[PDB]
Every structure is written in C-alpha cells, then in structure tokens.
Amino acid sequence: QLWPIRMDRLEGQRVCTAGGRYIVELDTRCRFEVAAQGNFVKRILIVEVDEMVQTVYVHRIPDRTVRGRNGEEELITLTNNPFVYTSYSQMPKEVQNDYMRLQKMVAVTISGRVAKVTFRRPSQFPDAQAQLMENGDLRIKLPRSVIVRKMDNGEIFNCIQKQAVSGITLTKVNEVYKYLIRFEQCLNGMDRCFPIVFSAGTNM
C-alpha cells in the first residue's frame, strides 16, 4: 500500500542522497527535504499519520534561502503557509512524484535495513541467524557472506553489487522465509513485541 506511509519501528532513520534528505522523525512523521538544482532547498514534504488518516504538508521555500543539509544536521525550519493534502489524489502529479520518492525510500531502502524478526539457528541453518527485514526481505548472515531474498521480485542471491549462486541452498531459503513469514503473519495476530530475536526447537 502506497497510502498512508508506514513508519512503524522506523523512528530516527535518515538517508542522504543527491536528491535531498530523507528523515523519519517519528513513527507517525517522516520528512523529505528535497534538494534542487543548485543544491538549495525549494521544497520540504512533511508526512504525518494520525491512526488511519494521513496529512501531507508541502512547504515551498524561496530559492537561495536554505542549502541542502547532511544527515545528522538540524531540521530545516518549516514555513507557515504549506499546501495541505488529506488524500493522495488531491496532490498534484508534480508533488506526487516527490511523495513517491519519500515513501519508496522509507518502505524499500530504509525498511530493508531494519531487522524485524531474527531467528537464531533454524533447523534450516543451525549455524547462523535468519533476519526478516521490515520490507519483507530475508537476510541470512553467514560467516563472511549474506544470503538475500528480495521481497519485491522474489530474487535470490548471495553477497560479498553482488551475486549470485543458487542450487541447493536456494531450496533451503524458502522454508525459513516461509517459517519467518509464517512467524510474522502469525505474530501479526498479536493483540494490540517487534522487533524480536528468538530460538526455537533444539536444543534449545
């Protein structure tokens, strides 16, 4: 789902690219300080979620007023007259593009770095730990190598971009992936936890 943006367990998280700065301020608020041509900030997107309703604040900054900032630097001061959007289609396409860049950075890149469930010594690999990331990706930490299963396209490759391999181990990744997805979706039936580290089976 593209709306609202999911920021659960993603607080404190930042990313800096050539396109600007992406900051998840709270589990209910993230930010996109868009860097423009000439490295000045002309637009700041604020995305805030109250339970199930989401508000997107689009601040417009006059040119040559504020420069694109690096990661741990202070948040740029916001304007007092931002455009306000309460639903996706209300946003114009030119603003919608900047919104896509932010939610992608949060749901794909950032969520891919954050471990949600980690399983130590599965019966599938009693010699390592299997990590299911926030974006659904599976990461199996081996000595000096990582077996990666991408949630988006189902691809499988071993790493040090990297690649690749397959054969016998590729069959092995799917049950632990299924186990953990089964563990997560089942643990998604938890009452209104994550992140979790566990061991199961033997011995033990």
174 touches Mg ion by CB under 5 A: no
121 touches a second copy by CB under 8 A: no
Contact 56, 45 (CB under 8 A): yes
145 touches Mg ion by CB under 5 A: no
Ranked by CB distance to Mg ion, the top (closest) residue is 129
> Could you please report the per-residue DSSP string of 14-50?
EEE-SSEEEEEEETTEEEEEEE-TTSBEEEEEEEEEE
| Residue 128 DSSP code | S
**Which structure tokens are listed for 170?**
């590729």
Site string (147-186) toward a second copy, x via CB under 8 A: -----------------------------------xx--x
**Shortest distance, CB of residue 104 to Mg ion, whole angstroms?**
31
84 touches a second copy by CB under 8 A: no
When binding is defined by CB under 8 A, the residue of 54, 55, 169, 199 that contacts a second copy is 199
What distance, in Å, lies between the first and last C-alpha atoms of the chain? 38
Q: Which residues bind a second copy (CB under 8 A)?
A: 182-183, 186-187, 189-191, 193-201, 204
